[PDB]
Every structure is written in structure tokens, then in C-alpha cells.
Write a protein that holds these residues in place. Structure first.
Motif, PDB file in Angstrom:
ATOM      1  N   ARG B  16       0.864  -1.227  -0.040  1.00 47.24           N
ATOM      2  CA  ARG B  16       0.074  -0.081  -0.094  1.00 47.24           C
ATOM      3  C   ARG B  16       0.675   1.371  -0.079  1.00 47.24           C
ATOM      4  O   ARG B  16       1.715   1.449   0.727  1.00 47.24           O
ATOM      5  CB  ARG B  16      -1.124   0.040   1.238  1.00 47.24           C
ATOM      6  N   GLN B  20      -1.419   8.671   2.985  1.00 44.86           N
ATOM      7  CA  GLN B  20      -2.896   8.283   3.701  1.00 44.86           C
ATOM      8  C   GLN B  20      -2.900   6.892   3.938  1.00 44.86           C
ATOM      9  O   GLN B  20      -3.544   6.437   4.997  1.00 44.86           O
ATOM     10  CB  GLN B  20      -3.886   8.904   2.915  1.00 44.86           C
ATOM     11  N   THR B  24      -3.929   0.750  -3.471  1.00 41.95           N
ATOM     12  CA  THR B  24      -3.159  -0.491  -3.213  1.00 41.95           C
ATOM     13  C   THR B  24      -2.287  -0.793  -4.847  1.00 41.95           C
ATOM     14  O   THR B  24      -3.053  -0.616  -5.803  1.00 41.95           O
ATOM     15  CB  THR B  24      -4.218  -1.506  -3.027  1.00 41.95           C
ATOM     16  N   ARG B  40      -0.051  -1.046 -11.833  1.00 39.52           N
ATOM     17  CA  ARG B  40      -1.172   0.020 -11.876  1.00 39.52           C
ATOM     18  C   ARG B  40      -1.522   0.147 -10.608  1.00 39.52           C
ATOM     19  O   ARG B  40      -1.492  -0.558  -9.478  1.00 39.52           O
ATOM     20  CB  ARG B  40      -2.183  -0.450 -12.631  1.00 39.52           C
ATOM     21  N   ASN B  41      -1.955   1.589 -10.125  1.00 44.77           N
ATOM     22  CA  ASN B  41      -2.419   2.285  -8.866  1.00 44.77           C
ATOM     23  C   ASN B  41      -3.846   2.157  -8.589  1.00 44.77           C
ATOM     24  O   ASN B  41      -4.636   2.659  -9.608  1.00 44.77           O
ATOM     25  CB  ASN B  41      -1.870   3.327  -8.445  1.00 44.77           C
ATOM     26  N   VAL B  42      -4.376   1.660  -7.308  1.00 47.79           N
ATOM     27  CA  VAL B  42      -6.026   1.525  -7.378  1.00 47.79           C
ATOM     28  C   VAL B  42      -6.524   2.440  -6.144  1.00 47.79           C
ATOM     29  O   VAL B  42      -6.006   2.742  -5.422  1.00 47.79           O
ATOM     30  CB  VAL B  42      -6.455   0.050  -6.962  1.00 47.79           C
ATOM     31  N   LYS B  43      -7.732   2.897  -6.798  1.00 49.78           N
ATOM     32  CA  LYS B  43      -8.822   3.558  -5.352  1.00 49.78           C
ATOM     33  C   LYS B  43      -9.252   2.638  -4.379  1.00 49.78           C
ATOM     34  O   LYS B  43      -9.328   2.830  -3.294  1.00 49.78           O
ATOM     35  CB  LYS B  43      -9.744   4.333  -6.250  1.00 49.78           C
ATOM     36  N   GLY B  44      -9.898   1.696  -5.039  1.00 52.51           N
ATOM     37  CA  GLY B  44     -10.871   0.760  -4.114  1.00 52.51           C
ATOM     38  C   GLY B  44     -10.078  -0.221  -3.419  1.00 52.51           C
ATOM     39  O   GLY B  44      -8.834  -0.237  -3.106  1.00 52.51           O
ATOM     40  N   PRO B  45     -10.701  -1.186  -2.619  1.00 50.74           N
ATOM     41  CA  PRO B  45     -10.375  -2.407  -2.198  1.00 50.74           C
ATOM     42  C   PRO B  45     -10.153  -3.612  -3.314  1.00 50.74           C
ATOM     43  O   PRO B  45     -11.208  -3.833  -3.943  1.00 50.74           O
ATOM     44  CB  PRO B  45     -11.361  -2.691  -1.433  1.00 50.74           C
ATOM     45  N   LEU B  54      -8.551  -0.461 -17.690  1.00 49.21           N
ATOM     46  CA  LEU B  54      -7.474   0.554 -17.998  1.00 49.21           C
ATOM     47  C   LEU B  54      -7.591   1.448 -18.957  1.00 49.21           C
ATOM     48  O   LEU B  54      -7.879   1.226 -20.101  1.00 49.21           O
ATOM     49  CB  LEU B  54      -5.936  -0.390 -18.233  1.00 49.21           C
ATOM     50  N   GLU B  56      -5.506   4.444 -19.959  1.00 46.29           N
ATOM     51  CA  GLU B  56      -3.966   4.631 -20.271  1.00 46.29           C
ATOM     52  C   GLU B  56      -3.920   3.324 -20.271  1.00 46.29           C
ATOM     53  O   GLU B  56      -4.273   2.418 -19.480  1.00 46.29           O
ATOM     54  CB  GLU B  56      -3.229   5.147 -19.309  1.00 46.29           C
ATOM     55  N   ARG B  59       2.141   3.808 -19.425  1.00 44.89           N
ATOM     56  CA  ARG B  59       2.197   4.706 -18.164  1.00 44.89           C
ATOM     57  C   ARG B  59       2.868   3.800 -17.003  1.00 44.89           C
ATOM     58  O   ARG B  59       3.967   3.658 -16.568  1.00 44.89           O
ATOM     59  CB  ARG B  59       1.295   5.255 -17.734  1.00 44.89           C
ATOM     60  N   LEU B  64       4.150   8.507  -5.060  1.00 45.77           N
ATOM     61  CA  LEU B  64       3.301   9.512  -5.314  1.00 45.77           C
ATOM     62  C   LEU B  64       3.027  10.675  -4.436  1.00 45.77           C
ATOM     63  O   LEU B  64       3.391  10.129  -3.622  1.00 45.77           O
ATOM     64  CB  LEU B  64       1.995   8.943  -5.943  1.00 45.77           C
TER      65      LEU B  64
END
Lengths: 191, 64, 313, 65, 73, 126
Positions: B16, B20, B24, B40-45, B54, B56, B59, B64
Motif C-alpha cells: 500500500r 494516507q 493499493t 497499476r495504482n488502485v482507488k478501491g479495495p 485500464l 491509459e 504508463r 506519489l
RNA sequence: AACGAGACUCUGGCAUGCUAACUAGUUACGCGACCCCCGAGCGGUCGGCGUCCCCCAACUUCUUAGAGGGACAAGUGGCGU
């Protein structure tokens, strides 16, 4: 009841999550048909488990919002049962299929995060997980139905049906659909 | 210059990030062609075996 | 001239199958004790997917069901349990006839006389108790009787007089006289802990074994010690055959059968696994019962499964 | 074990200047022989008995009686 | 005891457990297992009692995890 | 994690195992009975927690010697293993091959020996 | 090695197991009656929800409070010195 385990009276079988990946935190019942959108339900302990929860019930839970409405599941179950009936009148089908579709269509594929960015903080386009896609969708639709229903004569069951139907085939009439497109549009820039 | 949409399946959950701690890391088998594999980077669970969509499709982030 | 093959497997328990008992009245019945706290009575079809199907569960014990036995008829069941009690059940049905209370600790071993007019029990209390079918405890072969735990107590087939044989951790095997209620003979020689013991069909031999792996043969009649057979691994339960001169021992690695006259190792039964790698393993057989007709052999294993073998020429 | 083991007392000693507080606390060791006390060992205790006796590979043999 | 929903869940559990308890003493084991199968499969707890029960409220909030309010200064 | 056995427990496990190995077993249920016989432990939860950790040890010991535990039986086993010795390995086979100077080492040591020459090239530091 | 943490104690859930209970209940009578006909029967009579009878009925299942056991992340599989 003994032939097949229908919904209030609706069949679980033959509803197909028309959207790869989403398949599976939308929980119909790749065997799980029940009867009622109410359960003892212990979803909270684990991080994932919620996915197990029937999407219908998940939708019903999100329904009971706003401080006054908290804990009124019986009320939500009642609303949900009515909504499915209205949806069915409106297009035949399985309203449950209609429900699933709206959910599949609403989850923001792409989104944005507030990346620190130095100053004039810019926002980074990131893809969104399927759990989030499901979670977010159900909110959007519920917030959509609830928001519409409040100053109008129309009932939540009705507003819910309207939000669900418009979303099932993304009419963009829906609050939720407009919101999702907004979130996604934002995701694309930033990048 | 461009558009397409890409299906990708989670191979291995990295750990992670975000200060903050809310994004993930993920490794993705490229779905339409397995002979691809990217971070790739994720918002959710997110959990192994479920699928990203995807935009893009190059990349390939990091911190970050 | 002849060896044993795996006929089938019986299900349904969840705990480990600790004890087994056969009946001659109905050779089609099987009683089985388990950790699960229930005893299961099974009707054997031979049939065609489980060698048989479970008839009954005998609730009631709160704690590991350690040992069990049936009447010759197949009418009644006697179970022993950690719960510290003993239960007499009706096979047919269920319903405990009686509760045997009095032991301080886990009741390891149970046995009943041919008359059906004695019940004896072994326990972690280091005492051996003699009780009526009523539930009255007549004797407590007390007496420094075991320095130790009592793994098992068996009743010798007859005649001259009642004899009981106990096995205990203390690394000894004990012969007791019921008539007098005084210790008959001390068999010494084991040098680890004795897990199980069995009397031969006619009550002239004694086989006892535990952890080292040394199955021990004793002459009970002469009161002399015959010899020793090296099983290697730890042996949980021993059983003489009714018709053949064969002693079977559940070892850690598998069931080893051997033949006394002539002396040879008839077989090692290891059930398999297919394509498995395979690692860990053994739910070794903790229990075994010979059939009425020495034809069949039932074994209780840690996987919670009873595995059955039938002798064929 | 505080309840079992220690007795305490507070006393106010009035003196020309002011008052002093005397606190006395006694720990009574019937964990050793107390005694025979409400636990004996301090739940934080654990005595091992190892064997205590034993011998002999000593071949077979048997004794009559 | 309990209340209106509470009661429903209890009665349904009692009935299914009942039927199975009955097949266990009078009918045969395979039937009762068949029944535990159907229930346990689709389920709802029918044969097993849900643990979940009140947590005690702790001074400083009117709930168990709810903590009152603070203003600082 | 949240259950990390503390020394008072872990010690007792090392302890018993040292003086109890051939008595103890693979299985929780029995050692637990054994701890009643071979030790005086004040509460049942502790005695359980002890029986349990020492079993986790016995499970491990019975799969490979464990970092700080010794019992008479394990000593005997290592002892026997620590005998090995073959046809034997040097030989070294007819004739030692020398690096010379090592040849001049014997040559000027008054010492016969088997022979072979292959010792040339310098020879950088680092 | 000890101190705090922990272990420790308390409370509350899993125990058709334990020992018990008219200042706690339940079954089930004996149950008639009240007794309604609610359905069936023309009715006697049958099945039926409760109250009341209380009994030289039976029980401990719900209830109770005491003792009992269960959890040790026990087994298994990935990962990590």
C-alpha cells in the motif's frame, strides 16, 4: 418455494452480470437465491466479505440513510420489494437483472485521486477497483433516488425504479449516470 | 492522438502507498493477451483475480 | 496365501475415529466412537459407495468419545469418554440406559464380559473400575494399581475364572483377578508407554504395544513372557483375529499385520492418495476391529474416516 | 493476587505543622505457605516435576506372584 | 423475548432444528443429513445460533463505541 | 498478533521438553493431561497455553532440530550421524599434482613424494 | 529474573451433558369443567387455542445457579530468515 428458490417472487437463475470483472462482487446467486433482502448478515469483520452479500440486500441497506432512516431495514425491504415490482411493470424482465445492470453501468471505471502535487495540487488519473465500482454505484443510485424523492410527491420505491431503469440502459436521465460520467471525465484530464 | 479500453486481471497484490495509505499496488495480467504484465495504482479495495479497466494502457506507475 | 484389499470407506464422523466394535449377532452392524463426541452405528451394504451408511448418532457425551464396545447381539453399546463418564446406549435407537459416574478423569477404555454381566473401565485416574449394568461401581482396582495413566483394560475370554488385563503408561501390563479383586500378575518389560492391549480369542495370550513400536507377546496362562515384535513406529491399537493366527497393529505409518505361525509379516496396509506430492499425511489408524468372520477388517483413522479391507485369496 | 497477598493501610498523622500520610504495605509470602493460600503460587508460577525416578534398558524377564 | 424480527429468526431456527432433531431419533441419518444439507447450503443459520449480541456502553458516550462530544476551547 | 506467547509460557515449554521429550506427544490433548502429572501450574488457562505452545514445539522438533532445545534422544541421534567416512576422498588418485615451488617446497624439505608441474603466471592484487 | 503489559479477575454467548428446583417453568396427563361450537357429525362423539381445577403424574428442554467442558489461531494449505 420448493421448486426453485425465487425472490419475493423473482428467479435468480438466468441473471448474468453483463460485465466482466464486476462479475462477482455483484452477488446474485451462483447459487444464493433467497427470499428476502434481510439477513442477520455479518459482513463487517473481514475486508472482502461484503462481496458475498447479495447485491439486492446491499442496495436495500444503502437505502436506509439519513440520520432518521438509519436502522429502518424493514422500511427498506418494503421499498425494495415495491421497486422491483414497479421495474417489472415497466419492462418485464427481471427487475433484479435491471438492478444488476444499473450497478454494472454506474461504477466509475476511471477516477481521480488528490495527489499531493506541490502547491497547485494536481489530481492523478487512476483506475478504480471493482469493489469500489460496486460500492460507488450503489451509493450513486441510492443517493440519486433519495435526492429526487424528497421534495416530490413520488415515493422512493418509484424514484428508485426510475433511477434503476434509466441506469439499466444508461439513459443519462439518471443523477447517478451523470455523476459517474463526471467522475470519469475528471479522471481522464489530470492524466 | 488517441482512444481504446483495456481489460486487465490482478496477478499479485504488491502493498500500500499514498501517505494516507489508500491506494493499493497491483500487478496485471493483460487479459486479451497474457504476454503482457504491468503495475497499476488502485482507488478501491482490490484482491487477486478481479479485474481493472485500464484507460491509459502504458504508463505503469510507482510512488506519489 | 491371500492378502487384504481396500473394499471401500465409511464417512460421516468428523472427529477422529477412536474406537470400533463389531457384532456377531448382526455382522452387518458397526459401532464407532469418535472425537466428535458421537458414536455412530452403521449398516454395511457392501453396497456400492459407502461400504455402508450411518444408522445412528449417539449424542450425549460432552467430551471425546475414547472407546466403545457392542454386545454380541448388537443390542447395546458401551462408550467411554473424556467427559469422565460411561454410557450404555440402545443401538436400535439411541437412549442411554445408564450413566456410569465415579471416575475422576477421562475414561480411556471400556470393555464388557461375555455374560454381559460385568463392565470394566480404565481411566486417567489411574484406577480401573468394575461396574454393574445398573451403574453400580463394585470395585476400584486401586492400589498403586497403576503408577500412571491407564490406556486400556480388556476382559479375558474365559475359563477358569474372571481375569482382566490393563495397560498403562507406567510401562507395565497388569493381570487382575475379579473374583478376589486382587492383582494377579505383573508383566514387566515394555520400555515406553503402552497404548493398547488385546487378548487372544481363547485368552491364553496377550499382546501389548505403544510408542517404541515393540509389540509384546506374553503367555498369560503360564505366566511367562513369550517374545517381542519390532513394529518400529508407535502402535495405537492391536487386535487378534478370530480365525487366523494374525495380530494386526495400527502403527503411525500404517497397519501392519503379521502372522505368528509361521512367523512372517503378512502385510502393511497403507491407503493411498493419487498424484499427491505428498507431504504431511498420516491420520494414521487409531482404531481397529476384526470382523466376525475374520474376512473383514475395519480401521478408524485420523482423517475421520473408517477404511475397510477384505481378505481375498 | 494483590487482593490475596498484600495488606495495606493509610494513616493520617496530625503534627504541629500539618498532617503526614503514612502508607504501609505488607506482602505476605503464603504463596509460600499462605499457605495453602488462595492459589499458593503467584498465578505467575509454574513448577516442573521431571521424572523423579527411573532406569534400565534391562532385557526382558518376568516375576511370578 | 427479543422483539419482532428477533422473534421471527428464532422461531424459524427452532422449526428446522426441530425437524432435524426428529429425523435423528425416529427416521434415518441420511434423511436428516440431506436436510441439514439443504438448509446449511442456502441457510440463514437455520441449524446454528448466531452469536452476535449487545456490547455494553461505556461511560463517556451514550453508546458502546460512540464517544460523547468535545469542543476543546 | 495479537497472540504472542510470553516467556513465562515459552520457558515452561523449553523446560518440560528438556526433561520430558519421550513422554510428550504430537497432540495437544494428551500433553495437557501430562502437564498435570509432571508440573504444578496454577490456572487452567496457563496450563493449557503451556501444553499448546510446547506441542507446537514438538510438532516442529519432529520435523527438524529446533534452535535451542536439547533432549537425551536427540543427542544420541546426532552422535550416531556424526560418524561418516567413505573409501575416502583424499586419495588423491595416483600422483599429487603440485604447483611447483610447492614442488621446490618438498625438493628443499628432503622429501620424496609423487609429482606434477603446472605453476606459472602473475598476478594482480585487488 | 522481576515490575507495568500480559498472565490475573469480572461479565456475556456453545453445552436435549452434570447435579438439582411448589418463593421458577415445562411436558404430559388425570383432565373434568368453563365450554365454544371453530370444522366435521342430526347429536351422542372426533380433531381444535385458551383459562381454571389442582392432584399420591412425570421433567429439567426452555428458566434458574452451581459445578463441567470448549479456543490451543487445534488440522491442513501458501508466505516469511
Amino acid at each position: 418455494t420448493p421448486d426453485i428458490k425465487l425472490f419475493g417472487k423473482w428467479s435468480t437463475d438466468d441473471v448474468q452480470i453483463n460485465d466482466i470483472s464486476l462479475q462477482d462482487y455483484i452477488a446474485v446467486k451462483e447459487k444464493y437465491a433467497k427470499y428476502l433482502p434481510h439477513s442477520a448478515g455479518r459482513y463487517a469483520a473481514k475486508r472482502f466479505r461484503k462481496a458475498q452479500c447479495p447485491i439486492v440486500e446491499r442496495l436495500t441497506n444503502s437505502m436506509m440513510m439519513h440520520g432518521r432512516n438509519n436502522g429502518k431495514k424493514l422500511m427498506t425491504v418494503r421499498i425494495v420489494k415495491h421497486a422491483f415490482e414497479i421495474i417489472h411493470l415497466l419492462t418485464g424482465e427481471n427487475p433484479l437483472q435491471v438492478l444488476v445492470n444499473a450497478i454494472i453501468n454506474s461504477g466509475p471505471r476511471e477516477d481521480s485521486t488528490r495527489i499531493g502535487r506541490a502547491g497547485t495540487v494536481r489530481r492523478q488519473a487512476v483506475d478504480v477497483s471493482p469493489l469500489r465500482r460496486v460500492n460507488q454505484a450503489i451509493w450513486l443510485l441510492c443517493t440519486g433516488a433519495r435526492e429526487a424523492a424528497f421534495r416530490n410527491i413520488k415515493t422512493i420505491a418509484e424514484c428508485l425504479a426510475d433511477e434503476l431503469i434509466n441506469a439499466a440502459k444508461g439513459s443519462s436521465n439518471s443523477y447517478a449516470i451523470k455523476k459517474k460520467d463526471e467522475l470519469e471525465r475528471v479522471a481522464k484530464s489530470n492524466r | 492522438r488517441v482512444q481504446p479500453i483495456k481489460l486487465a486481471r490482478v496477478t499479485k497484490v504488491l502493498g500500500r502507498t499514498g501517505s494516507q495509505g489508500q491506494c493499493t499496488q497491483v500487478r496485471v495480467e493483460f487479459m486479451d493477451d497474457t504476454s503482457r504484465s504491468i503495475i497499476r495504482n488502485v482507488k478501491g479495495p482490490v484482491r487477486e483475480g478481479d479485474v481493472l479497466t485500464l484507460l491509459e494502457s502504458e504508463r505503469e506507475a510507482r510512488r506519489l | 496365501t491371500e492378502q487384504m484389499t481396500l473394499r471401500g470407506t465409511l464417512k460421516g464422523h468428523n472427529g477422529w475415529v477412536t474406537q470400533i466394535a463389531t457384532t456377531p449377532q448382526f455382522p452387518d452392524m458397526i459401532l464407532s466412537a469418535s472425537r466428535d463426541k458421537t458414536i455412530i452405528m452403521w449398516k454395511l451394504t457392501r453396497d456400492e459407495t459407502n461400504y455402508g451408511i450411518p444408522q445412528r448418532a449417539l449424542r450425549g457425551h460432552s467430551h471425546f468419545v475414547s472407546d466403545v464396545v457392542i454386545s454380541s447381539d448388537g443390542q447395546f453399546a458401551l462408550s467411554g469418554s473424556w467427559d469422565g463418564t460411561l454410557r450404555l446406549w440402545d443401538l436400535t435407537t439411541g437412549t442411554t440406559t445408564r450413566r456410569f459416574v465415579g471416575h475422576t478423569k477421562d475414561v480411556l477404555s471400556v470393555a464388557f464380559s461375555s455374560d454381559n454381566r460385568q463392565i470394566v473401565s480404565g481411566s486417567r485416574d489411574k484406577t480401573i473400575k468394575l461396574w454393574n449394568t445398573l451403574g453400580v461401581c463394585k470395585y476400584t482396582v486401586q492400589d498403586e494399581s497403576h503408577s500412571e495413566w491407564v490406556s486400556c483394560v480388556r476382559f479375558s475370554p474365559n475359563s477358569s475364572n474372571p481375569i482382566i488385563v490393563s495397560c498403562g503408561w507406567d510401562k507395565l501390563v497388569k493381570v487382575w483377578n475379579l473374583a478376589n479383586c486382587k492383582l494377579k500378575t505383573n508383566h514387566i518389560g515394555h520400555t515406553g508407554y503402552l497404548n493398547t492391549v488385546t487378548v487372544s480369542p481363547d485368552g491364553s495370550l496377550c499382546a501389548s504395544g505403544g510408542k517404541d513400536g515393540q509389540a509384546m507377546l506374553w503367555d498369560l496362562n503360564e505366566g511367562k513372557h513369550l517374545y517381542t515384535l519390532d513394529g518400529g513406529d508407535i502402535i495405537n491399537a492391536l487386535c487378534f483375529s478370530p480365525n487366523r493366527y494374525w495380530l494386526c497393529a495400527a502403527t503411525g505409518p500404517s497397519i501392519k499385520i503379521w502372522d505368528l505361525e509361521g512367523k512372517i509379516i503378512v502385510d502393511e496396509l497403507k491407503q493411498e492418495v493419487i498424484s499427491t506430492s505428498s507431504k504431511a499425511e498420516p491420520p494414521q489408524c487409531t482404531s481397529l476391529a476384526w470382523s466376525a468372520d475374520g474376512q473383514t477388517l475395519f480401521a478408524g483413522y485420523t482423517d475421520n474416516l473408517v477404511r475397510v479391507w477384505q481378505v481375498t485369496i | 493476587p494483590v487482593n490475596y497477598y498484600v495488606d495495606t493501610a493509610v494513616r493520617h498523622v496530625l503534627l504541629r505543622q500539618g498532617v503526614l500520610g503514612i502508607k504501609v504495605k505488607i506482602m505476605l509470602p503464603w504463596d509460600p505457605s499462605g499457605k495453602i493460600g488462595p492459589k499458593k503460587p503467584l498465578p505467575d508460577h509454574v513448577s516442573i516435576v521431571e521424572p523423579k525416578d527411573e532406569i534400565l534398558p534391562t532385557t526382558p524377564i518376568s516375576e511370578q506372584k | 423475548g427479543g422483539g419482532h424480527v428477533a422473534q421471527i429468526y428464532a422461531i424459524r431456527q427452532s422449526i428446522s432444528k426441530a425437524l432435524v432433531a426428529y429425523y435423528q431419533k425416529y427416521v434415518d441419518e441420511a434423511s436428516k443429513k440431506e436436510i441439514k444439507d439443504i438448509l446449511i447450503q442456502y441457510d440463514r443459520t437455520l441449524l446454528v445460533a448466531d452469536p452476535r449480541r449487545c456490547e455494553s456502553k461505556k461511560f463517556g458516550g451514550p453508546g458502546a463505541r460512540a464517544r460523547y462530544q468535545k469542543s476543546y476551547r | 498478533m495479537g497472540r504472542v506467547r510470553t516467556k513465562t509460557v515459552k520457558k515452561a515449554a523449553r523446560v518440560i521438553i528438556e526433561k520430558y521429550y519421550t513422554r510428550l506427544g504430537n497432540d495437544f490433548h494428551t500433553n495437557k493431561r501430562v502437564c498435570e502429572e509432571i508440573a504444578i501450574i496454577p490456572s487452567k488457562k496457563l496450563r493449557n497455553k503451556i501444553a499448546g505452545y510446547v506441542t507446537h514445539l514438538m510438532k516442529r522438533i519432529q520435523r527438524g532440530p529446533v534452535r535451542g532445545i536439547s533432549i537425551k534422544l536427540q543427542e544420541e541421534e546426532r552422535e550416531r550421524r556424526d560418524n561418516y567416512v567413505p573409501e575416502v576422498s583424499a586419495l588423491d588418485q595416483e600422483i599429487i599434482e603440485v604447483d611447483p615451488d610447492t614442488k621446490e617446497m618438498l625438493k628443499l624439505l628432503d622429501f620424496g613424494s609423487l609429482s606434477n608441474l603446472q605453476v606459472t603466471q602473475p598476478t594482480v592484487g585487488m
